């Protein structure tokens with residue numbers, strides 16, 4: 001069709017997107033490649049720099065020796081967007097720049113040297129929100145340091161403003177990046193990358209949204225996850241669902257410079273359940289998760305598992321599985337076990353997440369769709385067919401809404417459903 005969405009000017013939250021026509025759950029609203037993107041710090045050399053797929057088979061750029069790739073095709077295609085950054089990268093090894101700086105380098109190369117980008121159809125990098133009049137002095141110091149890091153990293157390819165676009169202010173561009181960066185997760189919901197998607201950046205936040213985004217490599221799909229009326233603002237949740245209203249407050253302040261007075265934030269919706277169990281215990285668990293989550297972002301599965309087991313099967317006092325810190329521990333342990341092939345133990349943690357995930361991810365949410373598929377997949381390969389089929393159908397009922405036929409993972413689920421169904425049919 002023409003578009004199901006259009007940019008408009010909201011009353012109190014700058015620009016927004018709104019429905020042009022009524023929308024149903026699962027309808028594809030928009031799709032976009034990035035303006036610019038980069039692999040994350042902790043997944044560097046663990047995933048293809050370009051398609052963001054994992055492998056043990058990864059060849060690597062001998063020029064800079066920082067880029068890794070899954071294929072000759074991926075190395076070659078990533079050359080135009082990695083030609084200019086190439087020199088700068090080698091030229092500063094091994095104190096590597098923060099992701100935000102590498103990301104902005106690619107933005108600049110792309111605005112200088114690229115044709116207009118399809119990702120900027122509804123809204124461009126130039127139009128993005130900076131919140132400059134809301135930034136705290138502490139935030140500004142932080143952005144100054146990013147500007148100086150950028151001028152250093154980029155010295156070879158960029159010495160002055162004629163090499164940057166028309167009047168382009170680097171302080172403002174980092175301001176834009178802070179509140180318009182998308183985290184790119186792979187099919188298994190692990191963080192692998194960071195990109196800008198300027199048309200998608202019109203979406204304002206809601207702690208109970210009507211839309212969802214999902215990624216297939218660097219490609220982004222925006223889908224409705226509820227019914228939406230003509231004229232209704234389109235929204236997505238910018239944050240992890242496993243957070244309390246206080247945690248959301250801090251993050252929405254610090255990164256996005258706004259205050260949320262939605263129903264959930266006004267009522268502290270779910271907050272008491274999330275923090276059930278003994279406070280001294282969940283305090284330490286939340287402390288240890290810093291490290292467990294760091295190890296995870298670096299794919300260090302045996303170490304993740306060791307630390308999770310010391311919590312889950314601790315000799316000292318334990319937490320309910322509905323406690324968010326406990327829950328995040330169980331999830332990391334599950335993922336560790338999957339990636340280490342300890343499938344019975346993976347299933348044990350996975351099944352325990354099921355009921356909390358039902359509660360903390362209401363309606364249709366891609367994170368729940370994927371977790372349910374994962375558990376269903378584990379059961380399937382232990383011959384637990386009736387319980388598998390149950391979970392695979394549930395995953396399909398979520399992911400037909402959240403991922404849809406345009407996302408290749410749905411094809412994988414379809415194969416699992418046909419397999420499980422074969423088994424039952426014959427039994």
Ligand SMILES: CCCCNC(=O)c1ccc2c(c1)NC(=O)C[C@H](C)N2C(=O)c1ccccc1F
Nearest residue numbers: 179180181182183184185213214215238239240
């Ligand atoms: C510019 C304003 C948008 C900021 N937000 C996002 O970029 C975003 C949020 C949540 C995401 C993703 C991206 N990425 C995905 O692949 C979808 C899944 C649902 N999702 C996560 O699970 C997630 C949860 C908390 C932290 C980071 C995460 F990636």
Ligand SMILES: C[S@@+](CC[C@H](N)C(=O)[O-])C[C@H]1O[C@@H](n2cnc3c(N)ncnc32)[C@H](O)[C@@H]1O
Nearest residue numbers: 013014015129179201202203204205256257258
């Ligand atoms: C990705 S942008 C969203 C588009 C933005 N409103 C614009 O005008 O370009 C993120 C910024 O939008 C604003 N924003 C998003 N959700 C909001 C909300 N629920 N209430 C108020 N402001 C919000 C904040 O300025 C935030 O830093």
Ligand SMILES: [Zn+2]
Nearest residue numbers: 048051070074
């Ligand atoms: Zn690749």
Ligand SMILES: [Zn+2]
Nearest residue numbers: 061063064086
């Ligand atoms: Zn290179």
Ligand SMILES: [Zn+2]
Nearest residue numbers: 207260262265
């Ligand atoms: Zn809220």
